[PDB]
């Protein structure tokens, strides 16, 4: 299947309480492998998955210097954003950056990303074609003119198609035993009465990887969206994920409703109904 | 213009005396670095700084320190200068294009003793009569000798102004004593005019050599004159004969 | 640049020809390359940057990059004398180190119309017992070797340009403090034209 690598970087100003806090994390698919925290003591990029540990000391120095420099760059970008938006020095603000690459089943480049949001709104982003920038507003346009003059688009494209893709292959091969694994979802159903006329059926998916999953309800094979509660997919904390979908049904009609589970580790989609004697 | 500023341009110091070379840049560049350049060894990075308070070693860091407290500055610090740090140093900076632009250069000589510093002696050699008769041309040779360190600029002056046509100077000084440790240096240059021009006793030729030596601040208690930064020249007049 | 085709010493091109400096880099993670020109004892000047595969052109320079072969190269059209310099290229590390490859010394040689190779003795203007020897007017073909004797100095070759006379010439200098030293034998250890003019030291 296809794979990704992403770094998610967050700068948060805290005026009166020191320099902005900077946190960056790296992920391969749904698995974290590095972090950096400006408040942490080590002042280093740090391992967060077993397979990145085989990286020599040169790797840690290199990554450390790059991400430190970036913290300072985004620190600066926060100052510049204040000026552009004539915002006050005593208010707290956020700057997020996200970038990374996708490769397909073959391991060839597929998609690249390089994006920023300021206070949780798109500021500037590299388009999908990696050739130009989409600027949200007047401010981001000044930024765009600068980056066009310094060919950042061409540089970051070279990075996204090259180093990023090469990085991802190396990580995938090194973490082979866990990153190439697909744990199929373990399933079951629960019944909630609520009222004598109407009962809740909850459909469980447990211990699956990767996170991507689809839970869907069907009454008499009909795509249900009335009375269909869907929760966010959650981490279990062991590298697996969980999710449930729930339907409120008229009573006695349990046996006519059905839950459908699609996941990468299920060759055939699973069909579920209340089944055993009960209701 | 729009480049880095290195201070000083030239420097002689004794082994062990702490020194620091400044590098500043008012272009708001995030990236600054120091390089040395040595015959046979290429241009190599010493230390580089990708942003404020971020600092990493190059391929030749040992014996050097840096700091990056503000954006505009990147000093190169030598705690205990050693003879192997005798070299040509460049500072460089870059912004978003990631292209590094290089400062003008600091020539640093680390010497065992200031008593080893000498100004150049300079002599002009007159064109050979044989040559004028054979080629109807006439070449003067300048020789600067006995100078240490090799911190010199040679130039030719005719009739009060500097000339460039018919000139060529050695790229590199020679060592007078390839054996000796702080061997003194020699440099050569030629100026070639027509026979007729040389044969005119109205024409006046000077070979000028700027030497960079001990500053005002250096202690000197020796018989011979303090080998300060100075100019030494040699002249010739045209001759009919 | 330190491989099977490691850049080796100088490169000379006929004036007016196209210069081709093709270099190999080892690290497959190299992405951005920067060409610099450095004149002897001067600062490296940026001439060309290249961020992706292919060719880039500014006036007479073409910067080339082939990420497959791992070749980075520079082409100089219509070589001029003033193009003579060292040419350096640099790339970034995974840590933001800039690493320079093997530099290339480029000497653009002009053809010597009428080489009149000769050795002359020149007398000092004041202290006339001192003198130098001048090997001048040789072709671009001849090579000046350093001396056998340690007490005799010989300088490398050097070209001068008498602009207004459309005349260029080569020269090297030799001198020595030894009493028995003579111009006649100053260049003994060099391979010099059979035809080299050696006149009695002075004169006419």
């Amino acid at each position: 299947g296809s794979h990704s690598m992403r770094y998610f970087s967050t700068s948060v100003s805290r005026p009166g309480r020191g320099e902005p806090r900077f946190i960056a994390v790296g992920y391969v698919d749904d698995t974290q492998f590095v972090r950096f925290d400006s408040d942490a003591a080590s002042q280093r990029m740090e391992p967060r998955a077993p397979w990145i540990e085989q990286e020599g000391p040169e790797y840690w120095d290199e990554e450390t210097g790059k991400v430190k420099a970036h913290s300072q760059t985004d620190r600066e970008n926060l100052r510049i954003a204040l000026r552009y938006y004539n915002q006050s020095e005593a208010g707290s603000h956020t700057l997020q950056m996200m970038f990374g690459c996708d490769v397909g089943s073959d391991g060839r480049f597929l998609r690249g990303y390089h994006q920023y949001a300021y206070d949780g709104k798109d500021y500037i982003a590299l388009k999908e074609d990696l050739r130009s920038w989409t600027a949200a507003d007047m401010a981001a346009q000044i930024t765009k003119r600068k980056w066009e003059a310094a060919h950042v688009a061409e540089q970051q494209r070279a990075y996204l198609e090259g180093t990023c893709v090469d990085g991802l292959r190396r990580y995938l091969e090194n973490g082979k035993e866990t990153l190439q694994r697909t744990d199929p979802p373990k399933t079951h159903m629960t019944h909630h009465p609520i009222s004598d006329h109407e009962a809740t059926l909850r459909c469980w998916a447990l211990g699956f990887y990767p996170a991507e999953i689809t839970l869907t309800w069907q009454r008499d094979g009909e795509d249900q969206t009335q009375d269909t509660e869907l929760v966010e997919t959650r981490p279990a904390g062991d590298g697996t994920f969980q999710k449930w979908a729930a339907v409120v049904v008229p009573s006695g009609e349990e046996q006519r409703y059905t839950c459908h589970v699609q996941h990468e580790g299920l060759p055939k989609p699973l069909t579920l109904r209340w089944g055993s004697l009960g209701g | 213009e729009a480049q880095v500023t290195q201070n000083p341009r030239y420097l002689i110091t004794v082994t062990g005396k702490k020194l620091t070379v400044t590098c500043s840049q008012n272009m708001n560049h995030e990236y600054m670095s120091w390089y040395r350049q040595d015959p046979g060894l290429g241009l190599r990075q010493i230390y580089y700084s990708m942003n404020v308070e971020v600092t990493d070693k190059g391929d030749v860091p040992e014996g050097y320190k840096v700091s990056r407290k503000e954006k505009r500055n990147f000093p190169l610090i030598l705690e205990s200068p050693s003879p192997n740090q005798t070299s040509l140093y460049f500072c460089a900076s870059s912004g978003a294009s990631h292209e590094q632009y290089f400062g003008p250069g600091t020539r640093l000589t680390v010497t065992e003793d200031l008593k080893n510093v000498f100004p150049p002696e300079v002599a002009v050699f007159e064109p050979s009569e044989a040559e004028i008769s054979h080629t109807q041309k006439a070449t003067l040779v300048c020789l600067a000798t006995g100078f240490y360190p090799d911190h010199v600029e040679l130039s030719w002056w005719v009739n009060g102004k500097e000339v460039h046509s018919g000139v060529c100077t050695d790229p590199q000084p020679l060592k007078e004593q390839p054996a000796l440790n702080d061997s003194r240096y020699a440099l050569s240059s030629r100026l070639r005019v027509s026979a007729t021009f040389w044969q005119n006793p109205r024409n006046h030729f000077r070979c000028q050599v700027q030497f960079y030596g001990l500053s005002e601040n250096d202690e000197w208690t020796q018989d011979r004159a303090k080998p300060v930064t100075q100019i030494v020249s040699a002249e010739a007049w045209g001759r009919a004969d | 640049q330190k491989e099977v085709e490691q850049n080796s010493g100088p490169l000379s091109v006929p004036e007016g020809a196209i210069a081709s400096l093709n270099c190999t880099y080892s690290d497959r993670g190299s992405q951005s390359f920067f060409w610099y020109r450095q004149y002897s004892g001067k600062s490296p000047e940026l001439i060309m940057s290249i961020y992706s595969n292919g060719d880039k052109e500014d006036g007479r320079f073409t910067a080339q990059l082939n990420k497959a072969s791992q070749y980075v190269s520079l082409l100089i059209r219509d070589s001029q004398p003033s193009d003579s310099a060292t040419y350096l290229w640099g790339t970034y590390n995974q840590g933001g180190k800039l690493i320079f490859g093997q530099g290339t010394e480029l000497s653009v040689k002009p053809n010597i119309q009428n080489p009149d190779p000769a050795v002359y003795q020149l007398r000092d203007s004041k202290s006339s017992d001192k003198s130098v020897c001048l090997f001048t007017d040789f072709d671009s073909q001849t090579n000046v070797s350093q001396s056998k004797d340690s007490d005799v100095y010989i300088t490398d070759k050097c070209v001068l340009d008498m602009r207004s006379m459309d005349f260029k010439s080569n020269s090297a200098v030799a001198w020595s403090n030894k009493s028995d030293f003579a111009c006649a034998n100053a260049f003994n250890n060099s391979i010099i034209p059979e035809d080299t003019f050696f006149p009695s030291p002075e004169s006419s």
Partner: peptide
């Protein structure tokens, strides 16, 4: 591997 982003300022 993290990208070299120096000088990429707003």
């Amino acid at each position: 591997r993290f990208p070299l982003t120096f000088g990429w300022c707003f």
